[PDB]
Write an enzyme that holds these catalytic residues in place. Structure first.
Site, PDB file in Angstrom:
ATOM      1  N   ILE A  21       0.851  -1.236   0.000  1.00 14.40           N
ATOM      2  CA  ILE A  21       0.000   0.000   0.000  1.00 14.40           C
ATOM      3  C   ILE A  21       0.871   1.266   0.000  1.00 14.40           C
ATOM      4  O   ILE A  21       0.358   2.316  -0.434  1.00 14.40           O
ATOM      5  CB  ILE A  21      -1.007   0.005   1.172  1.00 14.40           C
ATOM      6  CG1 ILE A  21      -0.313  -0.025   2.535  1.00 14.40           C
ATOM      7  CG2 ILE A  21      -2.017  -1.129   1.033  1.00 14.40           C
ATOM      8  CD1 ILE A  21      -1.256   0.094   3.709  1.00 14.40           C
ATOM      9  N   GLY A  22       2.118   1.187   0.480  1.00 21.08           N
ATOM     10  CA  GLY A  22       3.066   2.321   0.515  1.00 21.08           C
ATOM     11  C   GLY A  22       4.515   1.868   0.421  1.00 21.08           C
ATOM     12  O   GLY A  22       4.753   0.676   0.134  1.00 21.08           O
ATOM     13  N   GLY A  23       5.456   2.790   0.651  1.00 24.89           N
ATOM     14  CA  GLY A  23       6.907   2.515   0.669  1.00 24.89           C
ATOM     15  C   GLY A  23       7.623   3.073  -0.551  1.00 24.89           C
ATOM     16  O   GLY A  23       7.185   4.118  -1.069  1.00 24.89           O
ATOM     17  N   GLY A  25      10.871   4.182  -0.496  1.00 27.15           N
ATOM     18  CA  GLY A  25      12.059   4.776   0.149  1.00 27.15           C
ATOM     19  C   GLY A  25      12.063   4.548   1.654  1.00 27.15           C
ATOM     20  O   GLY A  25      10.998   4.749   2.291  1.00 27.15           O
ATOM     21  N   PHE A  26      13.217   4.140   2.198  1.00 25.26           N
ATOM     22  CA  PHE A  26      13.486   3.951   3.650  1.00 25.26           C
ATOM     23  C   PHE A  26      12.479   2.976   4.290  1.00 25.26           C
ATOM     24  O   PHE A  26      12.154   3.160   5.474  1.00 25.26           O
ATOM     25  CB  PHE A  26      13.445   5.299   4.379  1.00 25.26           C
ATOM     26  CG  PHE A  26      14.629   6.208   4.161  1.00 25.26           C
ATOM     27  CD1 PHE A  26      15.861   5.926   4.740  1.00 25.26           C
ATOM     28  CD2 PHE A  26      14.499   7.376   3.423  1.00 25.26           C
ATOM     29  CE1 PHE A  26      16.941   6.777   4.560  1.00 25.26           C
ATOM     30  CE2 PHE A  26      15.581   8.226   3.247  1.00 25.26           C
ATOM     31  CZ  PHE A  26      16.800   7.925   3.814  1.00 25.26           C
ATOM     32  N   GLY A  27      11.995   1.972   3.552  1.00 26.05           N
ATOM     33  CA  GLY A  27      11.062   0.953   4.076  1.00 26.05           C
ATOM     34  C   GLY A  27       9.842   0.788   3.192  1.00 26.05           C
ATOM     35  O   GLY A  27       9.760   1.484   2.165  1.00 26.05           O
ATOM     36  N   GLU A  28       8.931  -0.110   3.581  1.00 28.01           N
ATOM     37  CA  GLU A  28       7.682  -0.446   2.842  1.00 28.01           C
ATOM     38  C   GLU A  28       6.531  -0.631   3.835  1.00 28.01           C
ATOM     39  O   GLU A  28       6.805  -1.014   4.988  1.00 28.01           O
ATOM     40  CB  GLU A  28       7.882  -1.716   2.014  1.00 28.01           C
ATOM     41  CG  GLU A  28       8.924  -1.565   0.912  1.00 28.01           C
ATOM     42  CD  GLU A  28       9.194  -2.826   0.104  1.00 28.01           C
ATOM     43  OE1 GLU A  28       9.474  -2.698  -1.108  1.00 28.01           O
ATOM     44  OE2 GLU A  28       9.124  -3.935   0.690  1.00 28.01           O
ATOM     45  N   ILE A  29       5.300  -0.344   3.402  1.00 30.66           N
ATOM     46  CA  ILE A  29       4.045  -0.527   4.199  1.00 30.66           C
ATOM     47  C   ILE A  29       3.156  -1.520   3.438  1.00 30.66           C
ATOM     48  O   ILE A  29       2.998  -1.358   2.205  1.00 30.66           O
ATOM     49  CB  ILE A  29       3.310   0.809   4.469  1.00 30.66           C
ATOM     50  CG1 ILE A  29       4.191   1.875   5.138  1.00 30.66           C
ATOM     51  CG2 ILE A  29       2.059   0.555   5.291  1.00 30.66           C
ATOM     52  CD1 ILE A  29       5.106   2.652   4.201  1.00 30.66           C
ATOM     53  N   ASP A 135       7.403  16.278   9.446  1.00 29.12           N
ATOM     54  CA  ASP A 135       6.864  15.910   8.107  1.00 29.12           C
ATOM     55  C   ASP A 135       5.336  16.087   8.122  1.00 29.12           C
ATOM     56  O   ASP A 135       4.616  15.211   7.584  1.00 29.12           O
ATOM     57  CB  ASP A 135       7.305  14.494   7.724  1.00 29.12           C
ATOM     58  CG  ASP A 135       7.196  14.177   6.241  1.00 29.12           C
ATOM     59  OD1 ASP A 135       7.332  15.117   5.421  1.00 29.12           O
ATOM     60  OD2 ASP A 135       6.964  12.991   5.913  1.00 29.12           O
TER      61      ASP A 135
END
Length: 293
Positions: A21-23, A25-29, A135
């Site tokens: 669903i996301g990510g 850069g610097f990780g994934e969701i 952010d």
């Protein structure tokens, strides 16, 4: 180069990956299924080989904020050979997508002001436990996806967050230079000048969001160069931004312009501006949201 977790992979014999669903850069969701409780959850994964490790403090921040509103429930977290993970409550559509869904890309003042109140409670909340978000932008706030939560705004990504205090609650001394590694559209001039950000800089982001919600654009919307956006903001007559905004918002602006890195904000003043603005126009907390019917 590849998803850390492939579809239908299962984490600690409980969380079954559904989709990404996301990510990037610097990780994934990931959306994942809690095979115990049977509800869908947010599964955030960091590669354990990755140099910069933000997921540690995300959990830290997310743990200190358990028992406050506008924060995802903490389900699990774990370390292993290939990835670190955190498991969270899943939320619904974020404000960025919700504003683009509206015609004119604008929210009625009814919605804009009520979103401002909830976002400000959660900005006070993260400040209350000694962290800047740094952010603050619409894509980092989502509406609930449950009958209990569908009218609650949640604060989302704590990956750029910084501790401005210590255990004693003394303010940490700033760096002469701190490089700003974030979305520049809602960045304060201080962030643009690569100065140590403060609590005020989170309210600057709050200010610029509420303008874009009501007016539907910011003067620097088009510009993609970081330097240019900052020089435009540094000179711009912020009063202009308030031309079509409730007059009480002038109070909000003048206060945040007064603050520096060390000065604790007046969160009650800023909260008054929203309450009073709704008060005058007969807006109430039971009123529908533009995306409802």
């Amino acid at each position: 180069q590849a998803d850390i977790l492939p579809a239908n992979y299962v984490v600690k014999d409980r969380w079954k990956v559904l989709k990404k669903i996301g990510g990037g850069g610097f990780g994934e969701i990931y959306e994942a299924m809690d095979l115990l409780t049977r509800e869908n959850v947010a599964l955030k994964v960091e590669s354990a080989q990755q140099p910069k490790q933000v997921l540690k403090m995300e959990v830290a921040v997310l743990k200190k904020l358990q028992g406050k509103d506008h924060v995802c429930r903490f389900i699990g977290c774990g370390r292993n050979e290939k990835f670190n993970y955190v498991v969270m409550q899943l939320q619904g559509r974020n404000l960025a997508d919700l504003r683009r869904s509206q015609p004119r890309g604008t929210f009625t003042l009814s919605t804009t002001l009520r979103l401002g109140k909830q976002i400000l409670e959660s900005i006070e909340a993260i400040h209350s436990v000694g962290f800047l978000h740094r952010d603050i932008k619409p894509s980092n706030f989502a509406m609930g996806r449950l009958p209990s939560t569908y009218r609650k705004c949640y604060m989302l990504d704590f990956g750029l967050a910084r501790q401005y205090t210590n255990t004693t609650g003394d303010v940490r001394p700033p760096r002469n230079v701190a490089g700003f590694r974030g979305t520049v559209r809602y960045a304060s001039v201080n962030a643009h000048k690569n100065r140590e950000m403060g609590r005020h800089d989170d309210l600057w982001s709050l200010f610029y969001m509420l303008v874009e919600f009501a007016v539907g654009q910011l003067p620097w919307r088009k510009i993609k160069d970081k330097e240019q956006v900052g020089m435009i903001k540094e000179k711009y007559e912020h009063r202009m931004l308030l031309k079509h905004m409730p007059s009480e918002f002038h109070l909000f602006l003048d206060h945040i312009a007064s603050l520096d890195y060390f000065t604790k904000p007046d969160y009650q003043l800023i909260m008054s501006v929203f309450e009073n603005s709704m008060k005058e126009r007969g807006i109430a907390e039971n009123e529908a949201f533009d995306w409802e019917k």
